[PDB]
Amino acid sequence: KTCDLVGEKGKESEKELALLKRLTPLFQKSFESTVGQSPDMYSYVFRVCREAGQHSSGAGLVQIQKSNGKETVVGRFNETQIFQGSNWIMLIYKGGDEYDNHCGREQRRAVVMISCNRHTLADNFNPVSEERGKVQDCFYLFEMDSSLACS
């Protein structure tokens, strides 16, 4: 099980496929981070096209509430979209858990900005913000370094 792109097999973007192929070396890797104070003590676990959760729900990125260890799925890698610019790669996992009292109760979303760092294959995975104040198109933002994002 790897990331799934938009469209039945074959109608898929050769650009996005070429990118998935490029990110292969990060598949085996796992990224973690704990942000927040208390009602914010969160631990975000991120993976590229691999289960980042312990509930086998196909999570590409999970948000763990340190207090009670409850696991929330922020995005799923079978609803993945990717594209790159000159020195960055944007990764997006959709199909996350539904909001209950925010954003029209739409599924959660994770947006990961991958910037170019010649010094490491991958490192510095850091949560930036959560936009849950819109009627739609909300999301969680994270950033990380990777030499794969370089040209």
Ligand X SMILES: O=P(O)(O)OC[C@H]1O[C@H](O[C@@H]2[C@@H](O[C@H]3[C@@H](O)[C@H](O)[C@@H](CO)O[C@H]3O)O[C@H](CO)[C@@H](O)[C@@H]2O)[C@@H](O)[C@@H](O)[C@@H]1O
Ligand Y SMILES: *[C@@H]1O[C@H](CO)[C@@H](O)[C@H](O)[C@H]1NC(C)=O
Closer to ligand Y by Cβ: residue 4 or 131: 4
Q: What tokens were used for 43?
A: 């631990």
Q: By CB under 6 A, name the one of 39, 56, 135, 151 that touches ligand X.
A: 39
Rounded to 5 degrees, φ, ψ at 145 are: -95, 155
Neighbours of 62 (CB within 10 A): 25
Beta strands 59-65 and 31-35: pairing type? unpaired
Sign, CA dihedral 2-17-73-128, equals positive
| Nearest alpha-carbon partner for 79 in 54, 49, 51, 55 | 49
Instruction: Determine if 4 is a binding residue for ligand Y (CB under 6 A).
Output: yes
Beta strands 110-116 and 139-146: pairing type? parallel
Instruction: Determine if 18 is a binding residue for a copy of itself (CB under 8 A).
Output: no
Closer to ligand Y by Cβ: residue 50 or 148: 50
Instruction: Determine if 78 is a binding residue for ligand Y (CB under 6 A).
Output: yes
What are the helix (H) ranges across the chain?
14-23
Closer to a copy of itself by Cβ: residue 51 or 88: 88
Q: CB under 5 to 8 A by kind: which of ligand Y, Mn ion, ligand X, none does 102 bind? A: ligand X
Instruction: Determine if 141 is a binding residue for a copy of itself (CB under 8 A).
Output: yes
Does residue 44 contact residue 74 with C-beta atoms inside 8 Å? yes
Q: CB under 5 to 8 A by kind: which of a copy of itself, ligand X, Mn ion, none does 43 bind? A: none
Closer to ligand X by Cβ: residue 67 or 124: 67
For ligand X, the binding residues in 87-146 under the rule CB under 6 A are: 99-102, 130, 132
* Polymer length in residues for the chain: 151
Of the ranges 35-43, 54-62, 63-71, 80-88, which one interacts with a copy of itself (CB under 8 A)?
Answer: 80-88
Footprint on this chain of ligand Y (rule: CB under 6 A):
4, 58, 76, 78-79, 95
